[PDB]
């Protein structure tokens, strides 16, 4: 798997759900830097 020719990544943009934000894919490890490690719990709603 590789970027479509002449692109460096893919943007996966929801066309139906208006509230959903984008996802993205890259094909080369060097194109990302893991800058923050966040440790968390999800919280039960009240």
């Amino acid at each position: 798997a590789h970027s479509p020719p002449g692109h460096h990544s893919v943007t996966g943009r929801p066309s139906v759900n208006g509230l959903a934000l984008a996802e993205y894919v890259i094909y080369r490890g060097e194109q990302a830097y893991p800058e923050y490690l966040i440790t968390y719990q999800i919280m039960r709603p009240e």
Partner: protein, 162 residues
């Protein structure tokens, strides 16, 4: 090579990272099945990840991409959630391990919605949920996401049926 530097809750950087986490939660169409049911997180720790070599590898590539795209790296900050997080902080991201085809094919996935990344921390579809309780909506067990600097360059626009 990787060191993790704990940030303190009153560090501005801790605060802006948390706000990005918290503010990009949305509802999901599975009603919580994969990632669980919640509207916000309890942030327990934020660590800066420092690896000189992974940083140099990143910026070197960022510069190549930029030159191919009218001096525009198209650099974003995006969430990544998966069971590979512990390996990734040590080895960096590695596309050879990112071979499963998703909505957008094989590759390394990132999300603008923290809550989307949260769906994958325990595997595809949430896997079997947490190691301890096998509960995809576990409110006890600690989760980890990465907030990553990602070079998009010229990004192929794929409209999704989602």
């Amino acid at each position: 090579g990787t060191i993790l530097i704990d940030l303190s809750p009153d560090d501005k950087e801790f605060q802006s990272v948390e706000e990005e986490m918290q503010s990009t939660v949305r509802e999901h169409r599975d009603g919580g099945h994969a990632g669980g049911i919640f509207n916000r997180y309890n942030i327990l720790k934020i660590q800066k990840v420092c690896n000189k070599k992974l940083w140099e590898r990143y910026t070197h590539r960022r510069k190549e991409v930029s030159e191919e795209n009218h001096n525009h790296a198209n650099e974003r900050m995006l969430f990544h959630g998966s069971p590979f997080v512990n390996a990734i902080i040590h080895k960096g991201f590695d596309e050879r391990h990112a071979y499963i085809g998703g909505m957008f094919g094989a590759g390394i996935y990132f999300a603008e919605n923290s809550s989307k990344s949260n769906q994958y921390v325990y595997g595809i579809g949430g896997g079997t949920g947490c190691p301890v309780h096998k509960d995809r909506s576990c409110y006890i067990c600690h989760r980890q996401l990465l907030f990553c600097r990602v070079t998009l360059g010229k990004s192929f626009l794929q409209f999704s049926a989602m």
